[PDB]
Amino acid sequence: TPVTLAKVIKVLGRTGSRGGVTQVRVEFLEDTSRTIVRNVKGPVRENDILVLMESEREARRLR
Amino acid sequence: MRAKWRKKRTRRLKRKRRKVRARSK
Amino acid sequence: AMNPVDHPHGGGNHQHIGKASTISRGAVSGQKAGLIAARRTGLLRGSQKT
Amino acid sequence: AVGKNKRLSKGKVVDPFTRKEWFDIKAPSTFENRNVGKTLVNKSTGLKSASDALKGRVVEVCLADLQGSEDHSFRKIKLRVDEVQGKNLLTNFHGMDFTTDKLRSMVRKWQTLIEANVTVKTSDDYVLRIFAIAFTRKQANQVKRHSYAQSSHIRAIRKVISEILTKEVQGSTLAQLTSKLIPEVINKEIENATKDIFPLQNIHVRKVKLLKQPKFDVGALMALHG
Amino acid sequence: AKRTKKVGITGKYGVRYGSSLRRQVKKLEIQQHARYDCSFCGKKTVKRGAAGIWTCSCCKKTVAGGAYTVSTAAAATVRSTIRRLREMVEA
Amino acid sequence: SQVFGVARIYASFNDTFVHVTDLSGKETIARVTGGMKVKADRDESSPYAAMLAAQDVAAKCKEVGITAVHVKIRATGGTRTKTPGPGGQAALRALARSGLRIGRIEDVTPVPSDSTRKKGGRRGRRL
Amino acid sequence: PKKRASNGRNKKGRGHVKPVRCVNCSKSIPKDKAIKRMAIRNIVEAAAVRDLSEASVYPEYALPKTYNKLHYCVSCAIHARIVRVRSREDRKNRAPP
RNA sequence: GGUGAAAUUCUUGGAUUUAUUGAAGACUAACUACUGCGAAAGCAUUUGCCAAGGACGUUUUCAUUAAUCAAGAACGAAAGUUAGGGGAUCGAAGAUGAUCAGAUACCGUCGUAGUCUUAACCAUAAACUAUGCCGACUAGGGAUCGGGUGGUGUUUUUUUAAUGACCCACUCGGCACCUUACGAGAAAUCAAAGUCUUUGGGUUCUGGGGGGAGUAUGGUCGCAAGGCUGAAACUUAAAGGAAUUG
Ligand SMILES: [Mg+2]
Ligand SMILES: [Mg+2]
Ligand SMILES: [Mg+2]
Ligand SMILES: [Mg+2]
Ligand SMILES: [Mg+2]
Ligand SMILES: [Mg+2]
Ligand SMILES: [Mg+2]
Ligand SMILES: [Mg+2]
Ligand SMILES: [Mg+2]
Ligand SMILES: [Mg+2]
Ligand SMILES: [Mg+2]
Ligand SMILES: [Mg+2]
Ligand SMILES: [Mg+2]
Ligand SMILES: [Mg+2]
Ligand SMILES: [Mg+2]
Ligand SMILES: [Mg+2]
Ligand SMILES: [Mg+2]
Ligand SMILES: [Mg+2]
Ligand SMILES: [Mg+2]
Ligand SMILES: [Zn+2]
C-alpha cells in the first residue's frame, strides 16, 4: 500500500464556497525537489507533513 | 404586447377578413 | 376506373385501388400494374443521396 | 460510463501483438540519417502477403530528426513506402509541410500576409503543388506601426514568386528539389528578387504536395538507397 | 395601338388553360417566333423551321440549336469549356 | 536506441482519447478513453480519468516494446471549440511520469479555411 | 439615449461587416463588434514542464505554444469575466490594461 | 456521444478513434485594423478578360452648360414566391429526449422547406450616423488611407545609378479620432446638432397631445405573401424625452 509523505512549505489561501478548503504547495519528503499543489480540509500550517494517498494529481480551484 | 406580434396578429386578421369578404364577393 | 375483369385496380362502389399499389419485382404479368419494386414512395423531399 | 452499455452486440481471444512483427523504415539518400523508426504489421500469411498491406503507408517525420540539426524543427516530411526488401523497407518523398506553431508564430497582425501557389510538373514526371508564404516587415528607422503592402506590390511579388518556383522546379528532379528545399535557397532567391519591391521578411516555402506520381521505376528508387 | 395589356401572343388562347401556363408558353413562343442574328452572314434572318432547326433566310445556312432558342446556355458553356480544354491540351 | 510511437491525444470536452499508434499511424496500440475508467458522464473528461488512461496505455506500450512517443495533441476543431479539453495536459504529464520518453510535441487540431457553419443558430445557445 | 458614440462597435464607413460566431454559444455577431482576445499559451501548463524536460529524448527543446484567436459575444464576454461593466467616465478608456 | 445533470441515439454485425484516399456542395478563417472601395443595399482565395469610377497632377479644353427636386425611373440585405439545377452543412415547421405544476419554449438528437445557383418576381428592415443635399465661415492636436511636391535624409541594388520601401517637412481629397466650449442644446451631448428673438445662403421631404390606427373603406401594384396611398366614429389628461436622489 503506497502513500507519499509531503511537507507543506507555502500555504496559498482558502478555497471552496464556504472556505473550508486550503490550497497548499507541498514539497515531497522523499523524492525531494518535487512540488505539487493540493487541497487540505482541516487546519494546516507550514512545515506540516501531509500523507498523500496518491501523488499524481494537482488541484486548481473549488467553485 | 410587442409591436411585431401585434402586426402579425392584425395581418392574420386582415387575411381572414379578406377571405370572409371574398366569400360573398 | 375500369372493371375488375380489366385491371387489378378496377371495381368497387368507389374508385379506389384496394390493396397496396407497390408491386413486388417477383410478381408476374397481369399483376405488375402500379409501382413496380418501389424502394420508397410519396413526395421526394430532400436530396435522393445519389 | 463503464457499465452504461445496454447491448454490446446487435446480434446476441488472443493477443494480436504476438501475431505482429517489426519492420525498419529507411529514408532516401537526400538526408544524412536513414533509420527513421520502426513499423508493425501482421505476419505475412498466405492470404495477405503483408508487404502489400505495408506498401501504401505514409509516415511523417520531422526534418530536424532527419537532418540532425534543430533549425529544421518546424518542417515535416511525409515519406510514402514504395518497396520492401527484407525488414529494412525503403521510402520515398511524399510531401513537405510546416507545423502549426511555426505558421501561427509567423502570422501576426499589423503586417501583410502574402501567399502564392503553383501546380507545376517537374523533370521526372511528378506533379507538385508548391505553396509559398511571405510577410511584410518594418524597415529600420520606420516609425509607422503596420507596414502594409499596397496590393499591386503584392501582385508583383506573387508573380515573381510563382515564376521563380516554376523555374527552380523545372529542370530539377524530385531529389534535386529536396536538396534544394533543405538548405532553403529558394527563400534567399525570392528575397533577392523581391527586395526591390518590399523588405518582405519570412520568405518560407510552405507545404509541397504530390498530386500525381509516375510509375514506380524501382531502378530510380534503388538509385537513392545505396 | 396596344391591343392587349399583358397576354401578348397568347391572346389566341383566350381564357383557356390557365394564366400561369399561358405565361410560360408566352415566354417560349416569343423566343421560337423571334428572329436572330446569323453568325455567318451577320443579318437578322435566322428563323426556326422545326424544334432545334434554325435556318437563315439570306445565306441558307442551317444550324442545330435549341427547341425554342437558337442557342441554349448549356450549349454556350459547353462550347466555352470545350474551347478551354482544347486550349489546355497543348499547354 | 529508442523505439518510437505516436501518442495522438484527442482531449475534447466530455471525453479524452489516448491511443498510441506506429509512426505510420496504421497500427493501433492501447486505445483507452477517459470514460473507460470512471462511472459518470461528468468525469469522463476529468483530469484523473486522463491520467489513468495515460497510465494503462503506458503499461501496454511498455510491455509491447515502445519506449518513446511523438505527441499529437488535438482538440475538437472544425466548427467546434478548437481549445484543448481539461484532460490533455493531465494525460501528457501522466505518460511522461510513467517512464516513457517524449519528443516533438505538436498540435494537430483541425482548423478550417472558412468552415461550413457553426451549430446553434444566429442567436446562439440560449441558456 | 445613445450610450456610446461608436454604437458599441467599430464601423465608420462600411455599412456591413461579415459576422463571426461566438466561441462559447455560437451567436452570430459582426466581426467589428466582437470581443476578440488572443490566447497564446504553452502546451504543458507550466506544472509538467519539468517532467517533460527530464523525460524528453532531446535537450534544448523548444516546447512550442498553441495560439488561438477567441471571438466572444457581449453576453458571454460579460458572463465569463473577460470584460466587465465600467463607469460612465471610464467607459471611454480605449487603452488596454 | 452529448449536458448544469441526464436521456433519446450509435455500438463484437466493431461504434468512437487512427491512417490512406475519393466524391459532393458550401465557405474564403488566421492576415482583418476606431483600415479600403461602392449611390445605398453591400463587397475579403488566385489568375485572366470586360467595361466603369473617385481622388490627385495639369500654364489641356468647353463655356454657365449649375443646386435641390412633385411626377416619373434604375438599384435595393434577409425572409418569401414561380420554374429548372444543386441539395455537404446548418436548419422556420415537424418529430422526439429532457426540464417543468404545465413546456407543442429555452437545452439535446434527428430532420422538411430553405440555406447555393440560373431565369423571373417581390420593393420591405433598428435599410441607423435613428442626424436630407448643395455652398461659405468658425478652436486647437496628432495619427492614418490615396495622390502629388521638396529634402546632398536612411537602406537595397551594380559600394555607387533610376526605382522601390522608409524618414522629415508640406499640400489636396477621404474614413475617422483626441482635448476644450467662443457657441449651441431640455439635457444626454454636438466642430456640427455652431454662425438661429442680434430670428432670412439655396432647396426637397416630413410632424402638430395620446390611443383608436398604419385600422376600416376606396383605388393602384403584386402569382401570392403583401406593398403604396389612407380616414372617421369613439375614447383619454396625460402619454412621452433627458437627467437627479433613492
Ligand atoms: Mg365503370
Ligand atoms: Mg383480377
Ligand atoms: Mg377497386
Ligand atoms: Mg361506380
Ligand atoms: Mg437602457
Ligand atoms: Mg445595414
Ligand atoms: Mg474503426
Ligand atoms: Mg482568407
Ligand atoms: Mg486594405
Ligand atoms: Mg419544435
Ligand atoms: Mg420603412
Ligand atoms: Mg428613418
Ligand atoms: Mg457644410
Ligand atoms: Mg499624403
Ligand atoms: Mg488627411
Ligand atoms: Mg477614406
Ligand atoms: Mg397640436
Ligand atoms: Mg396626433
Ligand atoms: Mg428615461
Ligand atoms: Zn445568314
Short mmCIF file of N, CA and C in Angstrom, two decimals, chain D residues 3-127:
data_model
loop_
_atom_site.label_atom_id
_atom_site.label_comp_id
_atom_site.label_asym_id
_atom_site.label_seq_id
_atom_site.Cartn_x
_atom_site.Cartn_y
_atom_site.Cartn_z
N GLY D 3 -20.37 0.90 -17.35
CA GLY D 3 -21.47 -0.05 -17.36
C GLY D 3 -22.72 0.40 -18.08
N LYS D 4 -22.70 1.53 -18.78
CA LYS D 4 -23.90 2.04 -19.43
C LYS D 4 -24.17 1.41 -20.79
N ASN D 5 -23.36 0.44 -21.22
CA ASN D 5 -23.61 -0.23 -22.49
C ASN D 5 -24.83 -1.13 -22.36
N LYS D 6 -25.90 -0.78 -23.07
CA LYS D 6 -27.13 -1.56 -22.95
C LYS D 6 -26.98 -2.90 -23.65
N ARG D 7 -26.46 -2.89 -24.87
CA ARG D 7 -26.14 -4.10 -25.62
C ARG D 7 -24.74 -3.96 -26.20
N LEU D 8 -23.91 -4.99 -26.00
CA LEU D 8 -22.57 -4.97 -26.57
C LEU D 8 -22.61 -5.31 -28.05
N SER D 9 -23.54 -6.19 -28.45
CA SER D 9 -23.67 -6.62 -29.83
C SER D 9 -25.12 -6.52 -30.27
N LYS D 10 -25.31 -6.23 -31.56
CA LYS D 10 -26.65 -6.19 -32.13
C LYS D 10 -27.24 -7.59 -32.22
N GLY D 11 -26.41 -8.58 -32.55
CA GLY D 11 -26.88 -9.94 -32.70
C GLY D 11 -27.28 -10.59 -31.39
N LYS D 12 -26.29 -10.86 -30.54
CA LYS D 12 -26.51 -11.56 -29.28
C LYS D 12 -26.10 -10.70 -28.09
N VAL D 13 -10.01 -15.60 -28.15
CA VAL D 13 -9.31 -14.49 -27.52
C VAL D 13 -7.81 -14.73 -27.61
N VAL D 14 -7.11 -13.80 -28.26
CA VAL D 14 -5.67 -13.92 -28.45
C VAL D 14 -5.09 -12.52 -28.57
N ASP D 15 -3.92 -12.32 -27.98
CA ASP D 15 -3.23 -11.05 -28.09
C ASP D 15 -2.76 -10.85 -29.53
N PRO D 16 -3.10 -9.75 -30.20
CA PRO D 16 -2.69 -9.58 -31.60
C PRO D 16 -1.29 -9.02 -31.79
N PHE D 17 -0.50 -8.87 -30.72
CA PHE D 17 0.87 -8.38 -30.83
C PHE D 17 1.90 -9.49 -30.82
N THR D 18 1.53 -10.68 -30.37
CA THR D 18 2.31 -11.87 -30.69
C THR D 18 2.19 -12.21 -32.17
N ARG D 19 1.10 -11.77 -32.80
CA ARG D 19 0.80 -12.01 -34.20
C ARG D 19 1.49 -11.03 -35.14
N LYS D 20 2.20 -10.04 -34.61
CA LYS D 20 2.77 -8.96 -35.41
C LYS D 20 4.29 -9.01 -35.36
N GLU D 21 4.90 -8.31 -36.32
CA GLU D 21 6.35 -8.27 -36.48
C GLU D 21 6.78 -6.83 -36.72
N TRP D 22 8.05 -6.56 -36.41
CA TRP D 22 8.62 -5.23 -36.56
C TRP D 22 9.22 -5.06 -37.95
N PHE D 23 9.44 -3.79 -38.33
CA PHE D 23 9.87 -3.50 -39.70
C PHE D 23 10.58 -2.16 -39.69
N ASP D 24 11.83 -2.10 -40.15
CA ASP D 24 12.64 -0.89 -40.02
C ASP D 24 12.51 -0.03 -41.28
N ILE D 25 12.17 1.25 -41.10
CA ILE D 25 11.88 2.15 -42.22
C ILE D 25 13.09 3.02 -42.52
N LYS D 26 13.46 3.09 -43.80
CA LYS D 26 14.61 3.84 -44.28
C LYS D 26 14.19 5.03 -45.13
N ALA D 27 14.86 6.16 -44.90
CA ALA D 27 14.74 7.40 -45.64
C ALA D 27 15.63 7.39 -46.88
N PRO D 28 15.30 8.16 -47.92
CA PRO D 28 16.16 8.21 -49.10
C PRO D 28 17.51 8.85 -48.79
N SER D 29 18.37 8.83 -49.80
CA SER D 29 19.75 9.28 -49.64
C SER D 29 19.89 10.78 -49.51
N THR D 30 18.84 11.56 -49.75
CA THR D 30 18.95 13.02 -49.62
C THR D 30 18.70 13.47 -48.19
N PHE D 31 19.35 12.78 -47.25
CA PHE D 31 19.21 13.01 -45.82
C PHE D 31 20.45 12.40 -45.18
N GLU D 32 20.99 13.06 -44.15
CA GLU D 32 22.18 12.50 -43.52
C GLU D 32 21.86 11.28 -42.67
N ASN D 33 20.61 11.13 -42.23
CA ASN D 33 20.16 9.98 -41.46
C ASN D 33 19.20 9.15 -42.31
N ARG D 34 19.11 7.86 -41.99
CA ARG D 34 18.27 6.93 -42.73
C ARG D 34 17.24 6.22 -41.87
N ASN D 35 17.62 5.78 -40.67
CA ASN D 35 16.74 4.95 -39.84
C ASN D 35 15.78 5.84 -39.06
N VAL D 36 14.59 6.05 -39.62
CA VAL D 36 13.63 6.98 -39.03
C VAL D 36 12.57 6.27 -38.19
N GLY D 37 12.74 4.98 -37.91
CA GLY D 37 11.89 4.30 -36.96
C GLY D 37 11.58 2.88 -37.37
N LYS D 38 10.53 2.36 -36.74
CA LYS D 38 10.00 1.03 -36.97
C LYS D 38 8.48 1.07 -37.08
N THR D 39 7.94 0.06 -37.75
CA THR D 39 6.51 -0.04 -38.03
C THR D 39 6.09 -1.49 -37.85
N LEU D 40 4.78 -1.71 -37.70
CA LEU D 40 4.22 -3.03 -37.43
C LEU D 40 3.11 -3.39 -38.40
N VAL D 41 3.13 -4.65 -38.84
CA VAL D 41 2.00 -5.30 -39.49
C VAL D 41 1.91 -6.72 -38.94
N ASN D 42 0.87 -7.43 -39.36
CA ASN D 42 0.71 -8.84 -39.04
C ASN D 42 1.74 -9.67 -39.81
N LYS D 43 1.88 -10.93 -39.39
CA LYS D 43 2.75 -11.85 -40.12
C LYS D 43 2.23 -12.10 -41.52
N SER D 44 3.17 -12.24 -42.46
CA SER D 44 2.86 -12.35 -43.88
C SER D 44 2.32 -13.76 -44.14
N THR D 45 1.03 -13.93 -43.89
CA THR D 45 0.39 -15.21 -44.14
C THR D 45 0.17 -15.40 -45.64
N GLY D 46 -0.30 -16.60 -46.00
CA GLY D 46 -0.55 -16.92 -47.40
C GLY D 46 -1.66 -16.13 -48.04
N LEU D 47 -2.56 -15.55 -47.24
CA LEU D 47 -3.71 -14.83 -47.77
C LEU D 47 -3.53 -13.32 -47.80
N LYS D 48 -2.51 -12.77 -47.14
CA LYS D 48 -2.33 -11.33 -47.03
C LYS D 48 -1.06 -10.84 -47.70
N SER D 49 0.07 -11.51 -47.47
CA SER D 49 1.36 -11.11 -48.03
C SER D 49 1.70 -9.67 -47.61
N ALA D 50 1.91 -9.52 -46.29
CA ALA D 50 1.91 -8.25 -45.57
C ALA D 50 2.66 -7.10 -46.22
N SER D 51 3.60 -7.41 -47.12
CA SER D 51 4.30 -6.38 -47.87
C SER D 51 3.34 -5.46 -48.61
N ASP D 52 2.27 -6.01 -49.20
CA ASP D 52 1.36 -5.16 -49.95
C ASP D 52 0.50 -4.31 -49.02
N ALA D 53 0.15 -4.85 -47.86
CA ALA D 53 -0.60 -4.09 -46.86
C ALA D 53 0.25 -2.96 -46.29
N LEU D 54 1.56 -3.17 -46.22
CA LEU D 54 2.51 -2.20 -45.72
C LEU D 54 3.02 -1.25 -46.80
N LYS D 55 2.70 -1.53 -48.07
CA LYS D 55 3.17 -0.69 -49.17
C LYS D 55 2.65 0.74 -49.08
N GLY D 56 1.34 0.92 -48.97
CA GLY D 56 0.80 2.26 -49.11
C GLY D 56 0.84 3.17 -47.89
N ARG D 57 1.78 2.94 -46.98
CA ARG D 57 1.79 3.68 -45.72
C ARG D 57 2.60 4.96 -45.85
N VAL D 58 2.06 6.03 -45.27
CA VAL D 58 2.72 7.33 -45.19
C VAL D 58 3.12 7.57 -43.75
N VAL D 59 4.40 7.88 -43.53
CA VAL D 59 4.94 8.16 -42.21
C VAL D 59 5.50 9.58 -42.21
N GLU D 60 5.05 10.38 -41.25
CA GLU D 60 5.56 11.73 -41.07
C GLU D 60 6.72 11.71 -40.10
N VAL D 61 7.76 12.48 -40.42
CA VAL D 61 8.92 12.59 -39.55
C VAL D 61 9.50 13.99 -39.71
N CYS D 62 10.03 14.52 -38.62
CA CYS D 62 10.48 15.90 -38.64
C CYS D 62 11.84 16.02 -39.30
N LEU D 63 12.03 17.13 -40.01
CA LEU D 63 13.28 17.35 -40.71
C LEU D 63 14.45 17.55 -39.76
N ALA D 64 14.20 18.01 -38.53
CA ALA D 64 15.28 18.11 -37.56
C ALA D 64 15.83 16.74 -37.20
N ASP D 65 14.95 15.77 -36.98
CA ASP D 65 15.41 14.41 -36.70
C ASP D 65 15.94 13.72 -37.94
N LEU D 66 15.53 14.16 -39.13
CA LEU D 66 16.12 13.62 -40.35
C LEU D 66 17.52 14.18 -40.62
N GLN D 67 17.77 15.43 -40.25
CA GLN D 67 19.00 16.14 -40.61
C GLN D 67 19.91 16.41 -39.41
N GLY D 68 19.59 15.88 -38.24
CA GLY D 68 20.44 16.08 -37.07
C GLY D 68 20.33 17.42 -36.38
N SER D 69 20.39 18.51 -37.14
CA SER D 69 20.30 19.83 -36.55
C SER D 69 18.87 20.12 -36.10
N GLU D 70 18.73 21.21 -35.34
CA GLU D 70 17.45 21.63 -34.78
C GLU D 70 16.85 22.84 -35.47
N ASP D 71 17.51 23.39 -36.49
CA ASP D 71 16.92 24.52 -37.19
C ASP D 71 15.82 24.10 -38.14
N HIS D 72 15.77 22.82 -38.52
CA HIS D 72 14.68 22.27 -39.31
C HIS D 72 13.57 21.69 -38.45
N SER D 73 13.42 22.19 -37.22
CA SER D 73 12.48 21.61 -36.27
C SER D 73 11.03 21.90 -36.63
N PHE D 74 10.78 22.89 -37.49
CA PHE D 74 9.43 23.31 -37.84
C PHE D 74 8.97 22.75 -39.17
N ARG D 75 9.76 21.89 -39.81
CA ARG D 75 9.41 21.28 -41.08
C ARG D 75 9.20 19.79 -40.89
N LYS D 76 8.15 19.28 -41.53
CA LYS D 76 7.82 17.87 -41.51
C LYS D 76 7.97 17.31 -42.91
N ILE D 77 8.26 16.01 -42.99
CA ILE D 77 8.41 15.32 -44.25
C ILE D 77 7.54 14.08 -44.19
N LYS D 78 6.63 13.94 -45.14
CA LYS D 78 5.87 12.72 -45.31
C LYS D 78 6.64 11.81 -46.25
N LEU D 79 6.83 10.57 -45.83
CA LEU D 79 7.54 9.56 -46.60
C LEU D 79 6.57 8.43 -46.88
N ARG D 80 6.32 8.16 -48.15
CA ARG D 80 5.43 7.10 -48.59
C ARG D 80 6.26 5.87 -48.91
N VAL D 81 5.84 4.74 -48.35
CA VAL D 81 6.53 3.48 -48.60
C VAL D 81 6.26 3.03 -50.03
N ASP D 82 7.32 2.59 -50.70
CA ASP D 82 7.22 2.10 -52.07
C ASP D 82 7.80 0.71 -52.30
N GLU D 83 8.73 0.24 -51.47
CA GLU D 83 9.33 -1.07 -51.66
C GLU D 83 9.83 -1.66 -50.36
N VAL D 84 9.72 -2.98 -50.26
CA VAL D 84 10.13 -3.74 -49.08
C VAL D 84 11.12 -4.79 -49.56
N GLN D 85 12.30 -4.82 -48.93
CA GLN D 85 13.30 -5.85 -49.22
C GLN D 85 13.94 -6.27 -47.90
N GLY D 86 13.31 -7.21 -47.21
CA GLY D 86 13.91 -7.84 -46.06
C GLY D 86 14.10 -6.94 -44.85
N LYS D 87 13.01 -6.53 -44.22
CA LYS D 87 12.99 -5.96 -42.88
C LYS D 87 13.57 -4.55 -42.78
N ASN D 88 14.03 -3.96 -43.88
CA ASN D 88 14.59 -2.61 -43.88
C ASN D 88 13.97 -1.82 -45.03
N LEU D 89 12.63 -1.80 -45.02
CA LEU D 89 11.86 -1.24 -46.12
C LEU D 89 12.22 0.22 -46.38
N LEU D 90 12.26 0.57 -47.66
CA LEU D 90 12.69 1.88 -48.12
C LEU D 90 11.48 2.74 -48.46
N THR D 91 11.60 4.06 -48.23
CA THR D 91 10.54 5.01 -48.53
C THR D 91 10.94 5.95 -49.66
N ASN D 92 10.08 6.93 -49.92
CA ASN D 92 10.34 7.99 -50.89
C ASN D 92 9.58 9.24 -50.47
N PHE D 93 10.00 10.37 -51.03
CA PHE D 93 9.41 11.66 -50.68
C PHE D 93 7.95 11.73 -51.12
N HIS D 94 7.08 12.14 -50.19
CA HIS D 94 5.65 12.24 -50.44
C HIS D 94 5.08 13.63 -50.19
N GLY D 95 5.76 14.47 -49.40
CA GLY D 95 5.31 15.83 -49.19
C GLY D 95 5.92 16.50 -47.97
N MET D 96 6.30 17.76 -48.12
CA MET D 96 6.77 18.59 -47.02
C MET D 96 5.62 19.41 -46.45
N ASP D 97 5.76 19.79 -45.18
CA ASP D 97 4.79 20.67 -44.54
C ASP D 97 5.41 21.27 -43.29
N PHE D 98 4.94 22.46 -42.94
CA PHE D 98 5.32 23.10 -41.69
C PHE D 98 4.47 22.59 -40.54
N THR D 99 4.74 23.13 -39.36
CA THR D 99 3.97 22.86 -38.16
C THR D 99 3.08 24.06 -37.82
N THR D 100 2.03 23.75 -37.07
CA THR D 100 1.02 24.74 -36.74
C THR D 100 1.62 25.85 -35.88
N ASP D 101 2.50 25.49 -34.95
CA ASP D 101 3.09 26.51 -34.09
C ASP D 101 3.97 27.46 -34.88
N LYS D 102 4.71 26.95 -35.87
CA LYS D 102 5.56 27.83 -36.66
C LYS D 102 4.72 28.76 -37.52
N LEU D 103 3.69 28.22 -38.17
CA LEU D 103 2.85 29.05 -39.02
C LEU D 103 2.12 30.10 -38.20
N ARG D 104 1.62 29.71 -37.02
CA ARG D 104 0.91 30.64 -36.16
C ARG D 104 1.83 31.71 -35.60
N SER D 105 3.10 31.36 -35.34
CA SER D 105 4.05 32.36 -34.87
C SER D 105 4.43 33.31 -35.99
N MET D 106 4.47 32.81 -37.22
CA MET D 106 4.81 33.68 -38.34
C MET D 106 3.71 34.69 -38.60
N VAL D 107 2.46 34.24 -38.60
CA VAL D 107 1.35 35.15 -38.91
C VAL D 107 1.04 35.98 -37.67
N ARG D 108 1.33 37.27 -37.75
CA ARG D 108 0.92 38.26 -36.76
C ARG D 108 0.18 39.35 -37.51
N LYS D 109 -0.39 40.30 -36.77
CA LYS D 109 -1.12 41.39 -37.38
C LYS D 109 -0.31 42.68 -37.36
N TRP D 110 -0.86 43.68 -38.04
CA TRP D 110 -0.12 44.86 -38.46
C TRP D 110 1.13 44.45 -39.22
N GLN D 111 0.87 43.68 -40.27
CA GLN D 111 1.77 43.25 -41.33
C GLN D 111 0.89 42.49 -42.31
N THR D 112 1.35 42.40 -43.55
CA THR D 112 0.58 41.80 -44.63
C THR D 112 1.10 40.41 -44.94
N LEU D 113 0.17 39.46 -44.97
CA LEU D 113 0.42 38.08 -45.36
C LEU D 113 0.28 37.94 -46.87
N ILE D 114 1.26 37.29 -47.50
CA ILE D 114 1.27 37.07 -48.94
C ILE D 114 1.45 35.58 -49.17
N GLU D 115 0.48 34.96 -49.82
CA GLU D 115 0.55 33.55 -50.17
C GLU D 115 0.55 33.40 -51.68
N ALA D 116 1.26 32.38 -52.14
CA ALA D 116 1.27 32.03 -53.55
C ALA D 116 1.34 30.52 -53.67
N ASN D 117 0.85 30.01 -54.80
CA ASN D 117 0.86 28.58 -55.02
C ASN D 117 0.89 28.28 -56.50
N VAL D 118 1.63 27.23 -56.86
CA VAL D 118 1.76 26.78 -58.24
C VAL D 118 1.53 25.28 -58.26
N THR D 119 1.13 24.77 -59.42
CA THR D 119 0.66 23.39 -59.62
C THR D 119 1.47 22.73 -60.73
N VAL D 120 2.78 22.78 -60.57
CA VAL D 120 3.73 22.60 -61.67
C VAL D 120 4.34 21.20 -61.68
N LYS D 121 4.61 20.71 -62.89
CA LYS D 121 5.23 19.42 -63.13
C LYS D 121 6.74 19.57 -63.25
N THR D 122 7.47 18.58 -62.73
CA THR D 122 8.92 18.59 -62.69
C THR D 122 9.51 17.70 -63.79
N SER D 123 10.82 17.48 -63.71
CA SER D 123 11.55 16.81 -64.78
C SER D 123 11.24 15.32 -64.82
N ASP D 124 11.17 14.67 -63.65
CA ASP D 124 10.92 13.24 -63.56
C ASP D 124 9.44 12.91 -63.39
N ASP D 125 8.57 13.73 -63.97
CA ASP D 125 7.16 13.41 -64.19
C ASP D 125 6.36 13.32 -62.90
N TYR D 126 6.75 14.07 -61.87
CA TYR D 126 5.90 14.30 -60.72
C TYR D 126 5.16 15.62 -60.91
N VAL D 127 3.95 15.68 -60.35
CA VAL D 127 3.12 16.88 -60.38
C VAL D 127 3.03 17.39 -58.96
#
